Structure formats: C-alpha cells, structure tokens
C-alpha cells in the first residue's frame, strides 16, 4: 500500500508531517491532524492547499487528496473554515484556543482589520493567556513583545498592550481566550472570506462570505447584504457567479444578481464556499 508524505502548517506556525495511502480522501489526513491537535469540535475547521494558480483552496474531505492537489506538493495548512458567531457556545476551551490562533493570523495578515485600541486589547488577552500575569521584571520602558499583534507594529501599540495586560491580573488562559473572542467576534470583517469580483457593469467589487450571508462591498460606502434565508439558489457557469434573491412578500418573481469572477476556477471556488456556508449556518 503506497503512502504519500503530507506536511501541514499548524496555527502555531509549526509543521506536522504524516503519511496517508496515496488514494486517501481528505477526511483521512484531517482526522490525523485533528487527533494530533486533540481537537474534538472538528466541524469548524479544515485543511487548505495552494492550486496550480497559487490560489488557497479548501481540501474537500469527501474527495481523493491526489485529485485536488493534482500536480502540486502535498503541503497543507490547518485553518478555521466556519467562524462561529458565538464562540462562547463552543463545548471545549481547546476549540476556542485554535480559533484564537487563527484570528491572531487574520489580524497580523490584515485580513481582519482592527482599531488601534482593539489591536491592543486582543494583544493584551493573548499575552495574559500565554505568559500569565504582568511581570515588570520582563518589561521595561523599551519593551517590544515577541508576539505579533498587528499588520504594523508601533511602540505606542506595544505600550498599550502592556497597559491593558496589567489590568488582567489573575485571568486564566481559558478566561483570557474567551475575552479575546468576545471582542474579535464583533469586528465587521470577523469570519468574512473575501472574493474579488466584478458586478454586471464590470465595476470591481468584493463578495464576502460569512455566517450571516453574502456581503457585496461596492466600496466603504454602499454595502449590500443577502441573509442566507433570502438566497434560494447559488450557481456558476464559465467565469460567472449567480445568486437567486427571494421576491419580497407580494412579489411574483425572484431577482438574479450576476458577478464576473477572474476565471472559471475562481467562480467554482466562490460557489462551493457559499453552498458550504449556507448549509453550515442553516443548521447552526
Ligand atoms: C492583506 C489582506 O488584506 C485584506 O484581506 C483586507 C481585508 C479588508 N479589506 C476590505 C474590506 N471590505 C471590502 C473590501 N476590502 C481590504 C483587504
């Protein structure tokens, strides 16, 4: 039985290596990674890989790994796929922990924009969780943390992390992680997956996919929102992505909103993530 070596980048930045039979389905590898991570609430997570166009793709757990990575390396990342709107409802602290690690990368990467004060508050909770109580012996007036907190670090932000860390004395890691999540879950881009697109007049927009529905960003002014219940059918064809939008009470007919994606694979990827979000958040 021939086995392929898999390398998975974990949310702490470490590399997990394992082997699976070369005709394995994605679920096989994902089960090995989740066991390694002692993760039981696996439904919120998945593995990503980079396709021949260098686009992030979700590894479909029901399909052969080889028919997805195709010509590429068996290299993956472990990631949050479905961001829970209320992380307090998760059953296990360790689940909340992995969600914190993902969110920390969302913030540092700039995928999750955040005010100065919220960057410092989230950072202060991370430090409390990881180092415990504020120790002056560690930090002087020139302190810079090893922790990456933000897309652009400033001395002012380091100072504010320390000021807020001082306020958290006696806070346990689970408690600090829950506070982290209570703040992060409120940010306008929390759990929003952004896709570049053009509207039916060729005007560049972003489509965001999240728990509450599909968001259309025309810019920072005029954001259209389609709650999952107002969406009846999602489809792609060639480079085009279509959603059916319900008739408003006493309306005879659904409306169609069409988008142009960069290429056919980008349209299909957007369709699959929308269908998965629609299903997941219909049941939550
Ligand atoms: C370096 C990665 O940066 C991002 O993902 C940001 C995310 C936020 N943002 C938005 C927000 N709404 C509509 C359109 N774009 C700019 C791109």
């Amino acid at each position: 039985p021939k086995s392929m070596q898999c390398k998975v980048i974990l949310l702490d930045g470490s590399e997990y290596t394992c082997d699976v039979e070369k005709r394995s389905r994605g679920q096989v590898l994902f089960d090995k990674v989740c066991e390694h991570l002692n993760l039981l609430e696996k439904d919120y997570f998945g593995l990503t890989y980079r396709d021949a166009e260098n686009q992030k793709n979700w590894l479909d757990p029901a399909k052969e790994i080889k028919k997805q990575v195709r010509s590429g390396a068996w290299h993956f990342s472990f990631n949050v796929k479905f961001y829970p709107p209320d992380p307090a409802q998760l059953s296990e602290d360790i689940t909340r922990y992995y969600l914190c690690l993902q969110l920390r990368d969302d913030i540092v990467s700039g995928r999750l924009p955040c005010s100065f004060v919220t960057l410092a508050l989230l950072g202060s909770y991370t430090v409390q969780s990881e180092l415990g109580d504020y120790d002056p012996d560690e930090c002087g007036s020139d302190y810079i943390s090893e922790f990456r907190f933000a897309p652009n670090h400033t001395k002012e932000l380091e100072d504010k992390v320390i000021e807020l860390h001082k306020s958290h004395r006696g806070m346990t890691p689970a408690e600090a992680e829950m506070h982290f999540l209570e703040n992060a879950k409120k940010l306008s881009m929390y759990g929003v997956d952004l896709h570049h697109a053009k509207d039916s007049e060729g005007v560049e927009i972003m489509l965001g996919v999240c728990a509450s529905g599909l968001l259309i960003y025309r810019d920072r002014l005029r954001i259209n929102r389609f709650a999952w219940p107002k969406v009846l059918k999602i489809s792609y064809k060639r480079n085009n992505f279509y959603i059916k939008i319900r008739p408003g009470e006493f309306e005879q007919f659904e409306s169609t909103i069409g988008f142009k994606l960069p290429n056919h694979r980008a349209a299909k990827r957007l369709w699959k993530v929308c269908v998965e979000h629609h299903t997941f958040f219909r049941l939550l």
Side-chain angles (χ1 to χ4, degrees):
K2 183 168 160 177
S3 290
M4 297 292 290
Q5 190 179 56
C6 300
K7 296 204 166 160
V8 186
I9 303 306
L10 304 179
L11 284 170
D12 64 356
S14 74
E15 196 171 68
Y16 169 78
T17 314
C18 68
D19 300 275
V20 300
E21 305 184 12
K22 70 168 161 70
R23 289 257 285 167
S24 289
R25 315 254 154 189
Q27 191 71 38
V28 171
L29 175 60
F30 182 66
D31 285 345
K32 293 191 139 150
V33 170
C34 291
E35 176 188 284
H36 176 74
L37 291 178
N38 195 23
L39 169 69
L40 288 181
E41 289 183 287
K42 301 157 29 175
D43 285 8
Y44 302 94
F45 302 81
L47 295 174
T48 54
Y49 64 95
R50 299 311 200 93
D51 63 19
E53 296 184 302
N54 193 40
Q55 294 312 297
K56 268 183 203 179
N57 290 255
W58 294 100
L59 188 68
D60 190 325
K63 293 187 165 116
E64 294 183 7
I65 298 171
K66 71 177 168 72
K67 292 187 173 190
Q68 300 182 72
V69 300
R70 286 287 182 177
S71 69
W74 290 41
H75 291 178
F76 309 92
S77 292
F78 175 83
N79 292 108
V80 172
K81 184 168 185 181
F82 304 108
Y83 288 69
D86 188 0
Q89 280 155 52
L90 294 167
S91 82
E92 302 205 313
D93 291 335
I94 200 177
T95 313
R96 278 189 280 274
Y97 169 72
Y98 293 121
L99 176 58
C100 285
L101 290 186
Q102 174 73 70
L103 289 163
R104 286 164 61 183
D105 192 63
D106 293 352
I107 286 157
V108 167
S109 69
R111 289 190 297 279
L112 182 48
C114 194
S115 72
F116 174 85
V117 166
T118 302
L119 287 171
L121 189 61
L122 294 179
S124 78
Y125 285 128
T126 298
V127 176
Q128 179 70 26
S129 182
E130 307 229 332
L131 301 186
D133 293 337
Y134 171 69
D135 185 353
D137 303 8
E138 279 198 292
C139 98
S141 57
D142 69 349
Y143 184 83
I144 299 182
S145 172
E146 307 308 313
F147 300 109
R148 301 160 58 253
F149 300 126
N152 289 286
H153 300 292
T154 71
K155 180 52 163 47
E156 188 195 11
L157 170 59
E158 296 292 321
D159 290 350
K160 192 65 174 183
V161 170
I162 288 161
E163 173 193 292
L164 292 171
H165 179 203
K166 290 172 169 175
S167 70
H168 307 319
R169 183 163 301 272
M171 191 172 285
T172 65
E175 199 185 348
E177 289 164 18
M178 185 70 255
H179 288 308
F180 179 107
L181 293 168
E182 290 180 337
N183 290 277
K185 72 182 200 189
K186 297 177 186 194
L187 296 162
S188 69
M189 302 299 299
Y190 175 78
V192 181
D193 181 26
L194 289 176
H195 296 249
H196 285 294
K198 282 172 177 182
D199 61 11
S200 62
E201 319 173 352
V203 169
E204 297 221 56
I205 62 155
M206 296 285 255
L207 297 167
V209 181
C210 66
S212 52
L214 186 61
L215 317 170
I216 316 178
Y217 308 87
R218 309 204 136 278
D219 60 82
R220 267 36 281 319
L221 199 44
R222 284 213 270 273
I223 290 179
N224 236 287
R225 308 165 192 269
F226 297 111
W228 283 122
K230 307 223 99 72
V231 181
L232 262 185
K233 175 182 183 128
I234 317 171
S235 55
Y236 68 96
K237 194 194 273 219
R238 307 256 319 250
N239 297 342
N240 294 328
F241 171 86
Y242 305 97
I243 37 159
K244 210 141 87 166
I245 292 297
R246 272 194 213 278
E249 280 193 336
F250 311 108
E251 284 267 306
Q252 201 174 0
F253 308 117
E254 55 271 25
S255 53
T256 292
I257 326 186
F259 304 89
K260 174 82 62 210
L261 275 296
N263 55 69
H264 176 253
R265 290 172 61 86
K268 170 159 186 269
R269 192 143 57 246
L270 173 59
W271 167 86
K272 194 166 192 174
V273 303
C274 288
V275 170
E276 286 164 337
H277 274 73
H278 187 270
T279 302
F280 192 86
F281 288 108
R282 184 183 47 95
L283 296 163
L284 217 66

